[PDB]
Amino acid sequence: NDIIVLAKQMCMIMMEMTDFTRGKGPLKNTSDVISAAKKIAEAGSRMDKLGRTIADHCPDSACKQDLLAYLQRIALYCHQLNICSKVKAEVQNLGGVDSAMSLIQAAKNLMNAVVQTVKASYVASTKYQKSQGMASLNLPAVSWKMKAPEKKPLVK
Amino acid sequence: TTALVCDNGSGLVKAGFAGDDAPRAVFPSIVGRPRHQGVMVGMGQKDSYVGDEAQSKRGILTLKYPIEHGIITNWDDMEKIWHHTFYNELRVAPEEHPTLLTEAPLNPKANREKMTQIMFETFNVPAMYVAIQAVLSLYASGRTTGIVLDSGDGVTHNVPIYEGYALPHAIMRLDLAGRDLTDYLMKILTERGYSFVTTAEREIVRDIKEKLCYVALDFENEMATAASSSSLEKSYELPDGQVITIGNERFRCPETLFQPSFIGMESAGIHETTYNSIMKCDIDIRKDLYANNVMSGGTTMYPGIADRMQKEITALAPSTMKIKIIAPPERKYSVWIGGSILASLSTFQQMWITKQEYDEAGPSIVHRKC
Amino acid sequence: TTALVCDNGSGLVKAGFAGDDAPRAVFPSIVGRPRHQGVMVGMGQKDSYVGDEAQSKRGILTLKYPIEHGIITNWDDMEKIWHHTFYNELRVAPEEHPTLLTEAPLNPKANREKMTQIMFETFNVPAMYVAIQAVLSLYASGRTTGIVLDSGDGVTHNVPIYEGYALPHAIMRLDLAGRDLTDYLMKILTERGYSFVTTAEREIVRDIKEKLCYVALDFENEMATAASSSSLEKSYELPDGQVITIGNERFRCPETLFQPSFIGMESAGIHETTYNSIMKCDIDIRKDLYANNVMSGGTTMYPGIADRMQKEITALAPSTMKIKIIAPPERKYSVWIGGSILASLSTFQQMWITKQEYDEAGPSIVHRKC
Amino acid sequence: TTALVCDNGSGLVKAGFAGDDAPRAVFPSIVGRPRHQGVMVGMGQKDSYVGDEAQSKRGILTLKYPIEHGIITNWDDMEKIWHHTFYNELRVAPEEHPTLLTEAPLNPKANREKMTQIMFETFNVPAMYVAIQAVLSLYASGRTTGIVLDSGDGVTHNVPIYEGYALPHAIMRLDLAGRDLTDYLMKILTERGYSFVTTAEREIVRDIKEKLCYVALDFENEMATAASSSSLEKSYELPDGQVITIGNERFRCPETLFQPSFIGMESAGIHETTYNSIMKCDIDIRKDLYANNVMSGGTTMYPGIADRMQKEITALAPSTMKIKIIAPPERKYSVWIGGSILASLSTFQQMWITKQEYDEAGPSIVHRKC
Ligand SMILES: Nc1ncnc2c1ncn2[C@@H]1O[C@H](COP(=O)(O)OP(=O)(O)O)[C@@H](O)[C@H]1O
Ligand SMILES: Nc1ncnc2c1ncn2[C@@H]1O[C@H](COP(=O)(O)OP(=O)(O)O)[C@@H](O)[C@H]1O
Ligand SMILES: Nc1ncnc2c1ncn2[C@@H]1O[C@H](COP(=O)(O)OP(=O)(O)O)[C@@H](O)[C@H]1O
Ligand SMILES: [Mg+2]
Ligand SMILES: [Mg+2]
Ligand SMILES: [Mg+2]
């Protein structure tokens, strides 16, 4: 599944960003964070087309409404990261973990929106599989690696 | 090929697969809608949140319960709740699993009929069934005899069952449950200067009630103790760091179950209702009903409610009787556990309402099959 | 096909192209007119200077700000400012670029309406939009949750936003900003014998304030330190070579933000205003508002204002709270950066006010589109 | 030997003697303190002004209300208010007259307890009593059945009474009243360019609201009418001779009573609150509650509020019902008139809290005597 692998490699990037936040990870300082923000935004735009296609192959008054909501959130988060990274790049070039916090917060927001988009896409594809167009996408609820939900604790 | 079990309570949805021993989805049965001004582009496209989605964002939402008192009042929000349950929480396709649903007794027939219709026509379930929650509690308790008191967010009901036979004339329903206690606690928290008005603040007060409230074994000595000392006062930290202290609101709120007149109701307490239900049963089964007082539901989860329950019923019943209150530790999910016991039963598989039968006989099939 | 972003502040014009990461025109928002006798032929034909043109020649001009407190008061001088911005500074043709403009909240509606009319009828812009400067600051900070304190030459405003939803009842505007601090510094510079009266000398005092003033973490110990020693005294050289020295005017001038009573105002300091805005928000979003205190604008650029800001809000808020003040190094242009983020957004392109809509609905379209 | 009746509202003090038909002291419930520099010798010895004393000099004072929302927040300023009431306005000696005081329902118990203590220990009253303001309004209206909607500066409350019996579970309190409407009017007056920020200017805006505002019978057609024409615009002259004009702020400000979401509150309008209070009452008394909708308090004094009130409740209630809104011309003093009716009653004279009972049982006597 293209959606799953794209979102999950972005999750790898977003893990490396939190690891820099904890102060011990594969990124030395702000410049690595700026580069990571740029690539996570690019992968978010790719995710944006994947969501666009799954939405376009869906009936109107269907799960496509939530999916388009999450896609618009994705659009803004990727755009904020790209301009903010360019602003941080210019600031570094002229003159900062505090600076890294804005990019990391935007990345957290983007990753949360991407998780929401992933589950929305899965629901849209499963619910309307043998509707026409979705079959061409060939997303048969198995390419999605959906675990069974784990049982609740009876006593808390 | 595996049945689903959705316990639609007034407060929480308990959903899972038949055969399992615990629900896999337990989320609030609320739908939230934004009530403020969306000022960022794309951040206001989602117009409705369901379940934990709404409790997470409840600071900008208006939370609504589709079910009051066990009757579904909003059929478009409940429909959203069910869509969430099937697709986001359980992640199944409803048209392959038969679904077991639960309902309180003495409930409008249109409720059950419209549940049948929504299942069979919006979710295309192959079969479905609507079971009474107290019978399911007795299933989960491993008995076939006993009187079950089930208290939830919306309704408290007593159903006496003997050897698998219910006595429907002795069933008692009382529209006083967890949500009424939450409202009463919001009301009596104003005596200390704490004002919780919003629906989100109602969720905060529900949390306060679950964490701090308990049932006094003897109400008047507890009031005297709270007046004399400050030993019963406990603190609670609000979501923004303010700390509130409540002394006798802790046992005054649950006392409304034994003194419904606290909230202006004329009915009898749950002990009196239980006794009155036992005394509408045949004299030969009363001894076994006294000894099996199954308590289920989340409103029976107050510390000390079983002790007070037994003390009051012992006062009411004859002195030679055998009063035992059965309060399992997991009784917050007894209805779901019994529903999964029943839906997995081998002898139950001819008792589903198949979609063929629905197509023959309309939604009215559910009153004669169930 | 590329949008313009003009941030019309009371003090400075920040103009540039959407998508860029910095304005390309940042000049004073002043119009100067000669006040002396032109004695050479042809040297007095130009009757008005705009921007850096006027600061260069301010020794023979009377400088006027078209905007006081965020409201445009001179609509012929502001019109000159905009003509300068488009044609001399940016060197574009306005009728091909949509223009994004900014405005403070709780501002007269005629301001926004006349901005819409001037754009669409004098500059023929294909489309335009008026955005709130604090929402743009939150765009530039890379967040969708947080309370933004924005201080400019004319107005200090707080707008609490949570998950992209603004709480307009908790917006607080305070007409105390950089120009009031410049006036207060001119007033208290007279205690040392320095008299700056002319508008040009007001620009000199603004420079003194930007270079030498700072925010004391604790005002009373700083006053004691300045009284005891001369360690806090710094010198400044005037345009004609005189040197002035100021000791406690350095931290007394910015203290008017935390003690507005210094200039005779009854309002509360920016810390108290921020706290009061947080406490008009829903209790469930207060924790996230405490942790995201975005500060933008050039009056928040004093050395030590974020430390004092956090100390005061920490004193006001509960002790278990998560007070963080976010003061980016580039916060003097956060409104412009957020405006360029928004104007370049793909989802924003249906939110422009096109000239067709203006022709249908007059200038009143701007209250319902924006 | 004659009782006193002090109606401590959030906005005004209504004081007088029991048996009379009108208060003898009606002054603002404010305490003002100078905020400027006293430069003349002996002119700055008085450090605090109370009542009309403060409104007279409010141009150099900071006005503070000891009561917000019906809860006394400053107990040293309220103590000054009471000293003024007894000694300067009424000119009595408090230790010879029993004093009747009033309080809103669902109000903190410490408020009532500290009022009891202040009376009995600072003013040495021989006896005192605290009565609910809606019961007093029903006394003044000459009825023993009806639902009272009392709106003051701080709180709006609905108390349904039938045959002299209150239904305390159906009492609804709403912290939205005249001061919130004054604040909303200050907020929406900025759209026309009028900035009132100081506490004195808040008193000016309260005057504007009292003189010019009214309740639109149908809000949307009134907004359309105000947009189309200028027939609804009225002028007002400020204390220094400036004239302001307001067109739809006149009916937008009182609309916050029927659409509390205007000021960001989630609650229901006063019509919806009244209906919801009627429907928590027993079905057999609802018909008589519909026909007796007593409105008291000064926030119910808008032109057209009774017509809109009846239109909305008629829309909510069944069509065969008997909706009458009772709005006496003197309803701004219904609470005081009812308090003087009660305090003069012959059967009430054993219901005072004597100082002997206070000495036995502390301030806690007031919850069981009242
Ligand atoms: N530990 C607890 N103590 C007291 N009340 C509780 C506790 N846990 C849950 N509740 C109450 O139980 C109700 C939910 O119980 P549940 O049986 O799930 O209701 P329903 O059957 O309506 O879903 C809620 O109103 C909640 O206030
Ligand atoms: N380094 C600084 N320290 C203190 N104040 C400053 C500094 N730089 C600019 N200012 C003040 O900030 C104001 C301009 O800030 P800006 O955000 O551009 O205002 P506006 O939004 O009104 O254009 C000016 O009044 C100036 O006095
Ligand atoms: N004619 C009027 N129209 C509208 N509002 C009024 C009028 N007269 C008084 N008010 C409002 O009523 C409030 C005072 O009413 P009152 O019943 O005396 O309040 P309280 O009981 O709190 O003293 C004030 O806030 C004032 O704004
Ligand atoms: Mg239940
Ligand atoms: Mg600005
Ligand atoms: Mg009153």
Author numbering:
A (entry chain H): 710 to 804, 811 to 871
B (entry chain A), C (entry chain C), D (entry chain B): 5 to 374
Paste lines from the article:
The transitioning of cells between migration and adhesion is modulated by α-catenin, which links cell junctions and the plasma membrane to the actin cytoskeleton. Outside cell junctions, α-catenin dimerizes and links the plasma membrane to F-actin. α-Catenin is highly dynamic and functions either as a monomer or dimer. Here we report the much higher resolution (2.8 Å) cryoEM structure of human dimeric α-catenin bound to F-actin and the 2.7 Å cryoEM structure of F-actin.
To gain molecular and mechanistic insights into the important functions of dimeric α-catenin outside the cell junction area, we determined the 2.8 Å cryoEM structure of the human Δ1–21 α-catenin dimer bound to F-actin. Disappointing at first glance, the first 709 and last 35 α-catenin residues (and a loop, α-catenin residues 805-810) are disordered in our α-catenin bound to F-actin structure. However, the finding that the amino-terminal domains are disordered and therefore not in contact with the α-catenin FABDs is functionally important, as it makes the FABDs readily available for binding to F-actin and thus explains its higher affinity. Most α-catenin contacts with F-actin are formed by the second last two α-helices of α-catenin (residues 772–841) with two actin subunits. The regions corresponding to the fourth (residues 785-804) and fifth (residues 811–824) α-helices of the α-catenin FABD interact exclusively with the third subdomain (residues 145–180 and 270–337) of one actin subunit. The remaining α-catenin FABD interactions with F-actin occur predominantly with the longitudinal neighboring actin subunit. Such intermolecular interactions include a portion of fourth α-catenin FABD α-helix (residues 772–786) and regions of fifth α-helix (residues 834–841) with the actin DNAse I binding loop (D-loop). The most carboxy-terminal α-catenin region (residues 862–870) extends to bind the longitudinal neighboring actin subunit. Interestingly, the α-catenin carboxy terminus engages in intermolecular interactions with the fourth α-helix of the FABD helical bundle of a neighboring α-catenin molecule. This α-catenin/α-catenin interaction is formed by hydrophobic intermolecular contacts that include V870 with V800’ and L803’ or L869 with V796’ (where the prime indicates a residue on a separate α-catenin polypeptide chain). At our 2.8 Å resolution, we can fit the amino acids clearly into our obtained Coulomb potential map, which shows the electrostatic interaction of α-catenin K797 with actin E334.
